[PDB]
């Protein structure tokens, strides 16, 4: 290599640490009010509540309900906060523990026969937890009625609310309750002295579309605290990148949330939560020239 100046590579200082910035969690889906409610719908007219426009929560499994029998069927329970989904439906009701086995796709029983069923392409989380301290009435509660006498069978996502008297053997009933003609509704024992399989068990089902509509629902966004005067690998809500963040004077208008240059290169940002104006100064990008005699 004879005498002369050359070029080899780039002095690319390695980003020293990662920082994510997001606005704090102002809204929430009040799952306590979805769990710690006083009453819950009968297994016949189950509650098909709409959960939307709120931030989901997956704090811990054994919550107030303790998540006795929990299973996220077609989605990952781990990344629930990370996974972004919309159009949530909470199908909740009360059954027997022995009936808990009637949740999985295609599971049969009196619930799927006349009360409630769920599909075979399921993408939600079913949690049936022992309601032995909530629904257990010391004298037994029978107000959770179940239909058991009806000619046809019900399919998922279908809620029945009528009381059409059952006709057995095609014997005409003029509203008469007798031999081979019963009232379709019946009542559950649900006593505290019952067995574990006979304990009252409440079921909450969280089923959502996979980004069909605009994503009103989404998970929380942890926000690590920023650190300035280092080549941070920053990932703010709008964009990601690498740079050194510095306090500045740019008066970002209250609605304005980004700042750029003539050549559309984002350099000025506003803190997500608080009102801080950061300039993203570059990191070292100088070619590592080499001087030498031959």
């Amino acid at each position: 290599v004879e005498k002369g100046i050359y070029q080899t590579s780039n002095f690319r200082v390695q980003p020293t640490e990662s920082i994510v910035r997001f606005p704090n969690i102002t809204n929430l889906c009040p799952f306590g009010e979805v769990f710690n409610a006083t009453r819950f719908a009968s297994v016949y007219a189950w509650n098909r509540k709409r959960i939307s426009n709120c931030v989901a929560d997956y704090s811990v499994l054994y919550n107030s309900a303790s998540f006795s029998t929990f299973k996220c069927y077609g989605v990952s329970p781990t990344k629930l906060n990370d996974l972004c989904f919309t159009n949530v439906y909470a199908d909740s009701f009360v059954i027997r523990g022995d009936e808990v086995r009637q949740i999985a796709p295609g599971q049969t029983g009196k619930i799927a026969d006349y009360n409630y069923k769920l599909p075979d392409d399921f993408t939600g989380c079913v949690i049936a937890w022992n309601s032995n301290n909530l629904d257990s009435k010391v004298g037994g509660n029978y107000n959770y009625l179940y239909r058991l006498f009806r000619k046809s069978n019900l399919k998922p996502f279908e809620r029945d609310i009528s009381t059409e008297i059952y006709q057995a053997g095609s014997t005409p009933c003029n509203g008469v309750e007798g031999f081979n003609c019963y009232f379709p509704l019946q009542s559950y024992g649900f006593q505290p002295t019952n067995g574990v399989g006979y304990q009252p068990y409440r079921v909450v089902v969280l089923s959502f579309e996979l980004l069909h509509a605009p994503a009103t629902v989404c998970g929380p966004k942890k926000s690590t605290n920023l650190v300035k005067n280092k080549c941070v690998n920053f990932n703010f809500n709008g964009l990601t990148g690498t740079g050194v963040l510095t306090e500045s004077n740019k008066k970002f208008l209250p609605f304005q949330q980004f700042g750029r240059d003539i050549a559309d290169t984002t350099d000025a940002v506003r803190d997500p939560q608080t009102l801080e104006i950061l300039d993203i100064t570059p990191c070292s990008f100088g070619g590592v020239s080499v001087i030498t005699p031959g």
Binding site: G238, Q256, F258, G259, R260, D261
Partner: peptide
């Protein structure tokens, strides 16, 4: 109106 939240000064 401002469609983009970005900021560009004196350009």
């Amino acid at each position: 109106y401002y469609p983009d939240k970005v900021f560009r000064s004196s350009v």
